[PDB]
Ligand binder design. Structure first.
Ligand SMILES: O=C(Cc1ccc2ccccc2c1)Nc1cc(C2CC2)n[nH]1
Lengths: 258, 302
């Protein structure tokens, strides 16, 4: 356990409240829908797999996209340009060496130009006012894992899996803070793999009781159950790999007995 | 955008660099003196550089007296300007100018104290500096010192992976990095600080390596080649070699002669081999070495 472990969690909790996008922004977009967003994010996951990007990169990009769309009306044919720019910026921020812009233009099947991508980068930066270091579910899970005596790789992969799935559906995850989604994912994964529950140490650390996580937990469990039937499958595929101990193949418990 | 740039009068060039150029400038309307870092965006047509992305996004989150203030950001069609508060000198030039007389111990103590405060703030805000060296530390006539140059900085809400290219200049590079560890930790910034502390005190770089292997040997020759007992796991690290010479640890009173018991104690804790055991900026601030810290003003030969 680090020396600034606590100060950092406290600060992350403070910042997550600030980089929070508008929950009801999609209803106010005249041309795009949740499904279109779902399709975009699913696509970003593939891009991330194609260029072997960190998972954190994926989460930042989604955060950039949801904040951008919370104040800028975007048309169908431009949604992907916004997401491409968001992935480019996220890569620059998180990756050791991001793919060149040309690669991002390529993965769009030349739908846009190097020029359009760089201009959208500028606009996104302006709209977000260069505040790119946002807290993600990934970051909270990381902090949470240090509070796991029985360090279990299967538990971690699965929590990561459930955290990643929440990115796909604005409804109902947009209304939950990253620390809460992480909490639910952590418990659900721990429960499914070891039968253990939200640990006392994290209750003290986060102030979240199993009770407070219930609303999100019930939703995450539902997403888990329906996971195989979902229109978007890039994440399940990704988590079949041995790198993640094939946790997307694990069967979700029937009930949570909360 | 270009309206703001018109309000600045260029005074003189402060420094160069890859990212671009830094000029001392003056706000024509307010009279405020600043440092303008100009970045050309047509020298790669790769968009905004990753370094700017990070320095800007991380720096605007760090507001502390011992961290350089980013006042503004102006993004034109092909140019990116970062506006910083202005400080009279950087630690490297000052150390250079203090060669004959040396920097008074009270001022050295004051500077370390302030540097640890700035660093503690960075770390408690999940930011790793990663490039602490005399050149990146700014000082003014009042006796304050501030961390600057956050181009290589990184948020570690999620572990930061090691990169061959993006690394501290050799002389201040932590041993874990030289031995090829997987992830960075706050410990690498503390190590750099210890090296600077020693350099200020003795008037000579502590570990002036010529190469990576030579850097490691310089460190081993002074602090002793580390073993499993001193640093659990060291022999298993990627670049560790069982053929490494086995040097004995040099007596600290001979490495930094002008230092007293407290100074020697603090320095050795900052240079502890095991990164998990290396003292933190926070705990260093509580060390009895700073029992009598004050805030002297330097003799700046401007
Ligand atoms: O970097 C210096 C010291 C310096 C160095 C060289 C000079 C040459 C001429 C005039 C003033 C000069 C001042 N100061 C400074 C740099 C900055 C921001 C870029 C970080 N703010 N203040």
């Amino acid at each position: 356990v680090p020396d600034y472990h606590e100060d950092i969690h406290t600060y992350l909790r403070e910042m997550e409240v600030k980089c929070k996008p508008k929950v009801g922004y999609m209803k106010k977009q005249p041309d795009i829908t949740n499904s279109m967003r779902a399709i975009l994010v699913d696509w970003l996951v593939e891009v991330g797999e194609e260029y072997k990007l960190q998972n954190e990169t994926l989460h930042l990009a989604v955060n950039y996209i949801d904040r951008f769309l919370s104040s800028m009306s975007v048309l169908r044919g431009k949604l992907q340009l916004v997401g491409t720019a968001a992935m480019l910026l996220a890569s620059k921020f998180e990756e050791i060496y991001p793919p060149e812009v040309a690669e991002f233009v390529y993965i769009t099947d030349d739908t846009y130009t190097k020029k359009q991508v760089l201009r959208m980068e500028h606009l996104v930066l302006k709209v977000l006012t260069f505040d790119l270091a946002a807290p993600t579910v990934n970051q909270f899970l990381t902090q949470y894992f240090l509070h796991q005596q029985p360090a279990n790789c299967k538990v971690e992969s699965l929590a990561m899996f459930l955290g990643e799935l929440s990115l796909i559906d604005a409804d109902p995850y947009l209304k939950y803070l990253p620390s809460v989604i992480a909490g639910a994912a952590f418990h659900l994964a721990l429960y499914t793999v070891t039968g253990q529950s939200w640990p006392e140490s994290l209750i003290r650390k986060t102030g979240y009781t199993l009770e407070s996580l219930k609303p999100c937990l019930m939703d995450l469990h539902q997403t888990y159950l329906k996971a195989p039937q979902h229109a978007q499958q890039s994440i399940r595929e990704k988590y079949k790999n041995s790198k993640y101990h094939g946790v997307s193949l694990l069967n979700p418990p029937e009930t949570l007995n909360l | 955008p270009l309206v703001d740039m018109e309000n600045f009068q260029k005074v003189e060039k402060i420094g160069e660099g890859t990212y671009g150029v830094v000029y001392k400038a003056r706000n024509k309307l307010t009279g405020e003196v600043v440092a303008l870092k100009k970045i050309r965006l047509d020298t790669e047509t790769e968009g905004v550089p990753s370094t700017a992305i990070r320095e800007i996004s991380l720096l605007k989150e760090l507001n502390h007296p011992n961290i350089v203030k980013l006042l503004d950001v102006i993004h034109t069609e092909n140019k990116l300007y970062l506006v910083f508060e202005f400080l009279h000198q950087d630690l490297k030039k000052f150390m250079d100018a203090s060669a004959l007389t040396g920097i008074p111990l009270p001022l050295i103590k004051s500077y370390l104290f302030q540097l640890l405060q700035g660093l503690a703030f960075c770390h408690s805000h999940r930011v790793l500096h990663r490039d602490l060296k005399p050149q990146n530390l700014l000082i003014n006539t009042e006796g304050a010192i501030k961390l600057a140059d956050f181009g290589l900085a990184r948020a570690f809400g999620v572990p930061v992976r090691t990169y061959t290219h993006e690394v501290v200049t050799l002389w201040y590079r932590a041993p874990e990095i030289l031995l090829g560890c997987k992830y960075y930790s706050t410990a690498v910034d503390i190590w750099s600080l210890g090296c600077i502390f020693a350099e200020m005190v003795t008037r000579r770089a502590l570990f002036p390596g010529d190469s990576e292997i030579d850097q490691l040997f310089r460190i081993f020759r002074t602090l002793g080649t580390p073993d499993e007992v001193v640093w659990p796991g060291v022999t298993s690290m990627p670049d560790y070699k069982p053929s490494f010479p086995k040097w004995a640890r040099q007596d600290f009173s001979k490495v930094v002669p002008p230092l007293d018991e407290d100074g020697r104690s603090l320095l050795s804790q900052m240079l502890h081999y095991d990164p998990n055991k290396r003292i933190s900026a926070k705990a260093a601030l509580a060390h009895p070495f700073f029992q009598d810290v004050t805030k002297p003003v330097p003799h700046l030969r401007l």
